[PDB]
Amino acid sequence: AKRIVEPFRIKMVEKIRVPSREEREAALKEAGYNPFLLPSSAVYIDLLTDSGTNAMSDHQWAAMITGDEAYAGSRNYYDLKDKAKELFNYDYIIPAHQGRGAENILFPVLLKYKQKEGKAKNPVFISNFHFDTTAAHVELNGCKAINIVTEKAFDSETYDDWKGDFDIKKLKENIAQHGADNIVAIVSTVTCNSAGGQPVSMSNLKEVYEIAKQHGIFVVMDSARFCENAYFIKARDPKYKNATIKEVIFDMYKYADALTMSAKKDPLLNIGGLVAIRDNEEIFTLARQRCVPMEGFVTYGGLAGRDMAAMVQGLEEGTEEEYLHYRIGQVKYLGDRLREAGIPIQYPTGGHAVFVDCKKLVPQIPGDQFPAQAVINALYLESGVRAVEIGSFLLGRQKHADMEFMRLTIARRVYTNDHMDYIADALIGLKEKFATLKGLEFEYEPPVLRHFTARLKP
Amino acid sequence: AKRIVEPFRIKMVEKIRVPSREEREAALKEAGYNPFLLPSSAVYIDLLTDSGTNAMSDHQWAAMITGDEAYAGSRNYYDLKDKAKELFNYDYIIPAHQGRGAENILFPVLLKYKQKEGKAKNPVFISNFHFDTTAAHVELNGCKAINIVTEKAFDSETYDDWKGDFDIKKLKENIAQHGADNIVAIVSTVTCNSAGGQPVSMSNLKEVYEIAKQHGIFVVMDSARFCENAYFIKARDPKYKNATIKEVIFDMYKYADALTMSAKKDPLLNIGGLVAIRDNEEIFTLARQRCVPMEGFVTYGGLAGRDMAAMVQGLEEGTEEEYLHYRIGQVKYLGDRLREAGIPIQYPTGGHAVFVDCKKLVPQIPGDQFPAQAVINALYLESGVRAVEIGSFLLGRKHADMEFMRLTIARRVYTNDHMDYIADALIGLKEKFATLKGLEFEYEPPVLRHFTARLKPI
Amino acid sequence: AKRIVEPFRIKMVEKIRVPSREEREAALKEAGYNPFLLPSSAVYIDLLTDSGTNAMSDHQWAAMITGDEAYAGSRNYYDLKDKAKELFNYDYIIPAHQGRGAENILFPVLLKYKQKEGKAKNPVFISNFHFDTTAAHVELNGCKAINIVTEKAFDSETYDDWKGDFDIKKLKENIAQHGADNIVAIVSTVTCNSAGGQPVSMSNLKEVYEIAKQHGIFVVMDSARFCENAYFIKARDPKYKNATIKEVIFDMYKYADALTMSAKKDPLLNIGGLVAIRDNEEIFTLARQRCVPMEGFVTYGGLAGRDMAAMVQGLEEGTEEEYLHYRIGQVKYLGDRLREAGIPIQYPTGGHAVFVDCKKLVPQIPGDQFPAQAVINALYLESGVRAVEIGSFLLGQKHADMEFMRLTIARRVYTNDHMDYIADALIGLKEKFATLKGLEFEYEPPVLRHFTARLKPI
Amino acid sequence: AKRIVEPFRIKMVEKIRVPSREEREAALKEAGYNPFLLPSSAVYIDLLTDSGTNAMSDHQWAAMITGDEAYAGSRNYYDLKDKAKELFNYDYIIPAHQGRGAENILFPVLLKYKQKEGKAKNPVFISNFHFDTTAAHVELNGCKAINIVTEKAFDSETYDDWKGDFDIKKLKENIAQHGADNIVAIVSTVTCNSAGGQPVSMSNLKEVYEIAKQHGIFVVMDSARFCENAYFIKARDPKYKNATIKEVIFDMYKYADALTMSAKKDPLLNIGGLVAIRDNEEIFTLARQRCVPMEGFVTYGGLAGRDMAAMVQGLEEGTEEEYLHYRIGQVKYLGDRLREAGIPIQYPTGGHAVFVDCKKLVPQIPGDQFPAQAVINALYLESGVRAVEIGSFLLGRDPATGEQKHADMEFMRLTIARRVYTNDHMDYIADALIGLKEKFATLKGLEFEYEPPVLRHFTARLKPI
Ligand SMILES: *[C@H](N[C@@H](Cc1c[nH]c2ccccc12)C(=O)O)c1c(COP(=O)(O)O)cnc(C)c1O
Ligand SMILES: Cc1ncc(COP(=O)(O)O)c(/C=N/[C@@H](Cc2c[nH]c3ccccc23)C(=O)O)c1O
Ligand SMILES: C=C(/N=C/c1c(COP(=O)(O)O)cnc(C)c1O)C(=O)O
Ligand SMILES: C=C(/N=C/c1c(COP(=O)(O)O)cnc(C)c1O)C(=O)O
Ligand SMILES: c1ccc2[nH]cnc2c1
Ligand SMILES: c1ccc2[nH]cnc2c1
Ligand SMILES: [K+]
Ligand SMILES: [K+]
Ligand SMILES: [K+]
Ligand SMILES: [K+]
């Protein structure tokens, strides 16, 4: 494995502590064996998400301090509008309080727009892979969320350059099956979070957009990790090995009509989101009319002015190639420590997380005994590291658990490679009691979203 | 008019300027004669709103700096849960990114809950007066927003202690006509924003909650300005003459089942909101399930951790009687400066804004040609002060019974010398009020036109 | 009296409170009847000094957050050097932790430079008026500190444009009596703090610099309140009535060879100082050699990088005429309030404080019993406002020409409503002035006794 | 070499950049081959000092935001006074703007105090090793700065537990040859910076104080790195194996009557200093009277209230053993990476810096041609790392001959700021110096282009021969 040095130095620290196993195990009892219900006081290193836990720069805090809190016409709204025009070449912006706020703004509008003239009677969204909140909004609006990720993503340990690509064959089949008139939009998720943070190639984005444009289908770029996608295109696509990251981004967004962004990811923020529309004024007007009751007035969108100011700065810092190389290299370093030790991962590692594959380390625990969770709980009891499950405890009602992933999600510019080593050694050291591991059962199961609030028991 | 001194001193300043007349003339023309389209660079004193423009304390900023940004289990979530138990005696909280996000969490849930066993077939919400976003969410969910403020609120110059009271006669009348099966919730707005920021008496809240409980009707306390309501209760109710502000609050929330709070008002914040439920754990569970797709995870709700930390501190600071006395007295001071110059206003002044009747200043302008807005634009050209129009321009395509101008005062931002500037600007126009002309449309959108309609003189 | 409105609004507040009369009585006895020994918690409105108590801007705080803390070559050192070149046309800077650090850097250097050829055996410094730390460093280096302010400064109620001027005839008399070879330097203090913050005219500074040059005498501009002095030159000198503040400043510094500056005054800071030298590289090198053991390395001088960063921004904001108009106008407003009620003050009021002439307020108490200090302690017990003595106590018994109580006004901290509290407090003691007693030492330090001396009433 | 994980995570970052090889070649020439004259923009990793460059915590910044800026009686002065009582059991405090301001407050007062009754006719100060600013203030007040560090410190490759100890034999001899009337004070420097950030044992501190106490000699603990000293005492003195760091500190200061502190070191600050005095109220009153002209009023002492607020919190954080273990272990890691590559260093590594013995690195460069500076300049040109010399360039010219003052060592100091750099930054530093091993032989000495008379190392210009 290769350690890559920080292209920065530390200016402010935040204390963290590992609770004693007596404290650590008592906290898991009261938590009901669900890490989502643990308080942060009980977590050493927190790998639950890369969302909103990033470390900002001094320039970002300086922007927050001079942020314009005006209810209408904030200086930072116009800055954010100019920045989206610079990065994506899109003429219209609506800030949102975070990613799913942006989805709430835009997806109901696209459905209403598609259902003009009385079409879209069987409305669907098609994505390489809809993220959970994205799919939830698709379905809350009475549509179907169709995921057509490339089959390469399903062969975890076999390298491929672009495991986030659309299955182009399935895109055409679905357009034929449902009809272009029922397809509300195509959602291109970059990077493809649910496939393991795996990149979508520039030629896949291009071909998907050209196919959709030919059928008059609107394309939204789910852009939470668009900079981590742009880096992979520069690193794996020869046509772009000599291009700046901003050049890769500018081309990427020729292949979408709008974007929804969680700025809690690649823009390096702790809160914030964005809608941006290339040139459809009518959809922009309609989305603004939804923004007002759901989020806020159209020039802050549920954000403080200081957070729009931090977004303007964080959008620039997140395109910097030397940071991205360090960021994605640190993720790759953790993955290499793991697979050099014989732990299966989605290879290659994505931009933001290491995905530990199905539990070939706990064979005695089946699907509905939650094998990834028992790993996570022993991993938590042995080290204090909170990870998130992507398996039979997330999927729910039992829909076939094709993968028993464990996601080690890494916040940006927060943890060092020595933190990565601690993570790796903890998980490797679980090859002592991996076999002698008890399964878990529902002591309290909620009707929906159980992985958030279900109380389990060994 | 009596000045009351700040119970604080200034620790940090934000510099503001008066644009030159040429610049103000040019800016307003660029804005199409609609101050909601003005950038903040075009405004000197901004009285558009009291929402999110408040000045925070050093303790609030310090609380933000140590804020826990954890995705799940943030330490500040538990502090906020405790604070809401302390202030209101409510056992459950769901943070929200701001007030209309709190409404979007709670209100659809209250309807679904009422629809059990085929009730709520013609559902309605009843309020002393529903705010704009409050009624919008009621209407968005297929319900009717019914306002039954006391008739005393319509007699603008006649003093009354409680111009935000429920009309009890209309409350039982509406329960009789619609049936308790159709009343999803009663919403107690404290203070009553649309009545001029006018207080609701403790007895009015008590009788309303008694009537709603005898019919099994859920009661939501819209709590954006609950501290100004608590101050007015202590000032004007002999029963609470020697009670602390927190003791007045604690009694207030014995007369509701839940609250929706915009923390951007009285809790002295730039962003933030809150749902709190007294003891109904089923409604709490259901609201959490709506929180996840719409706002975020249930322990941050679309807020940064630093803002939950700022909210915990602001909730305390907003209850301090000496601050409330100064804040509400500053609003009173501006209102007294205007009355003493013969300007009609809603009397007495409410807790956060002065409301001017423009039908008397510009009688030569009918309501359909926006007399109040023509005063606001003249006020702007002469002063750079930005007000907000409550009248035919806000009402929409509709005969408005009043052409108001709201001078909304942010908390701890402007001095009484700023109040003097505002008063003197409006007064100085006394002889030009009759020589100025109304506005017509250059551009008008279909809904909520007051944000983006471009007007033109005649 | 004319209230002038803030050219800014409040962005952050700080709690202050009024201690009870019991608290005040115990605190003053505990402090040895010396308000300098009072804790800040025992003070309501603190008028002890205008030094380091100023409210910074959000831009100043933003500068601190990106401040460069490097030990050598901080980015903000070079920014400060450029700013000094811009404002004063001076080519050399040495930062200092505050004003008396700057004096400790430069004065001993000037003493040894002057006597490098076996002359200056009876070394003296000449000033319109050395402030106390200035005179202390003069005497601490074995020199005499001569003060020759205009006789106009001693006639309190009689207006004059330039009550800080040098007495040019005394300057000539002192040069002849002591000889140019014994005059280490002329210090031009602007504004003249000890005369009441009273301005020096451009033609006075010019005539002093020309007299010094023909005799070969080095001139140091004590620059703590140089921007206030510039404002008065533009206010009262028809030659400069239509110049900018920065043009006035530029012309001022053609009439010195170097400056010492407490940046805790006009540059709007809480800490910081500065030495700047026009073009004498030898004295610059000698001053740097002393800076290293006394203050720090020459590119930070005992300041954090963030404080140099704040100083670059504050040097700009401190020159803004709209700011200076408000600041000096607030001082004038408190003075006019007291003058209208018959309280004798130094008229016209200076830039930073109102100086109450206690020689007339309490004529029964002779100067050796500190009449102004008896009024100050009475003002504190009566109201919790803490002021400072600029008379016999501070002079270190040396005969005093002025017995002042100084109401010193911090920049951008208190409102005119705080000023009304101060004025009404002092006005309300009009009948108790005669019934006041002198004070007597119980512990007297040898150097600058007034800071730590313990006193007892008579 | 063992890497040790941070007992914290990162909350705020500051960008850094590697100037291109040519940028470093131009900048070092503009700086006259003296890195002290390079701007911070010319530097990648800055190892010039560990003073004032530390990374603060969120609690520290929060404390600054609520800091009381009052001129007299700031709430944070009383907090700082209580913290010094809790930590050291000392009853009196005087803030200073930083450590050499604390020295300027107290050392002239100490000489004046001893001078009563005609004593101190030929005054001296005795220390294990006076630091540069400390000796300058001693000498500025007309005293001689005597340094009696244990001879073990000169044997850089030979390990010892307490290379910062006083030499007790030389201490008694110096009390004999000068007389207790001429010893203004003994200055215990913890850790001993000049000796390599090397700890002083508790029994060495105790014996020195007992010797001085029976002879009427005031003892000042130079306390810039007292927490790092305390960690080493717990780490190497079996007596305190079971003690907390605060208990070790509390014992250390039974063996002094006052302290002077640069809070820009172990209290994790960017600015700040402190005089604290155990019980001598007369010394405290005199030091207060000097504080007023030189630093400021006695309740802020030349510090903004926010910095006193940050000091109270940083004083606490700097005592936390889990932080000290990581901090000192990071320094040890850099040293071990260098030792494993055959690079000679002061062994064991001290608390705050790795000291590289440059006499053995560049034999072809004599002491007058600045061997340590030549290594430092090559290290900068090769990697953009800025280090500092503790050798013949800092020493200067002998006042009695006008030629090079012969140095008994020739260190390059890799000074590590607290909580700023990661162990991957340490690898960059080590690899940079290792990668010059074959190039050391072809390194050339340095020659003056501009030389000032005093303190030439801060501002002199040089050129290669
Ligand atoms: C907040 N009301 C604020 C802000 C606001 C919102 N819509 C407005 C239209 C016109 C003028 C001001 C407007 C106000 O200034 O009145 C509020 C809410 C909604 O909270 P949120 O703005 O944080 O989402 C709900 N209920 C009441 C009583 C409010 O005052
Ligand atoms: C033991 C000791 N005492 C006193 C001081 C003086 O404190 P301050 O600098 O706050 O006034 C220092 C400073 N030592 C720093 C700073 C320093 C001074 N001179 C230097 C020469 C070269 C490199 C650094 C420094 C160091 O890096 O060792 C010190 O190490
Ligand atoms: C919540 C995270 N993801 C959010 C996300 C979202 C939702 O963004 P918010 O969490 O900011 O609502 C949308 N689209 C994609 C591809 C996403 O990854 C997460 O990784 O935990
Ligand atoms: C402290 C103030 N004066 C300081 C001062 C000083 C000393 O600056 P410092 O307080 O920053 O040392 C020097 N010169 C002049 C003309 C001054 O007015 C004061 O007026 O309270
Ligand atoms: C994993 C972790 C956090 C999430 N928040 C919303 N969806 C998620 C998936
Ligand atoms: C009066 C008040 C404060 C002072 N600081 C320095 N000199 C002073 C005189
Ligand atoms: K967050
Ligand atoms: K806001
Ligand atoms: K201060
Ligand atoms: K520093």
Author numbering:
A (entry chain D): 2 to 398, 405 to 465
B (entry chain C): 2 to 398, 406 to 466
C (entry chain A): 2 to 397, 405 to 466
D (entry chain B): 2 to 466
Describing publication, verbatim:
Tryptophan indole lyase (TIL, EC 4.1.99.1) is a pyridoxal-5′-phosphate (PLP)-dependent enzyme that catalyzes the reversible cleavage of L-tryptophan to indole and ammonium pyruvate (eq 1). The reaction mechanism of TIL is of interest since it catalyzes the β-elimination of a carbon–carbon bond with a formally poor leaving group, indole. The functional assembly of TIL, and the asymmetric unit, is a homotetramer.
In this structure, only chain A is in a fully closed conformation. This chain contains a PLP complex that does not retain density for the side chain of l-Trp, so it was fit as the PLP-aminoacrylate complex. Above the β-carbon of the aminoacrylate, but not connected by electron density, is additional electron density that fits to the BZI occupying the putative indole product site. In addition, N-3 of BZI is hydrogen-bonded to the OH of Tyr-72* (3.0 Å). Chain B is in an open conformation, and there is electron density attached directly to the β-carbon of the PLP-amino acid complex, but there is no electron density between NZ of Lys-266 and the PLP. Since the ligand carboxylate is not in plane, this density was fit as the external aldimine of PLP and l-Trp. Thus, this complex was refined as the gem-diamine complex of l-Trp and PLP.
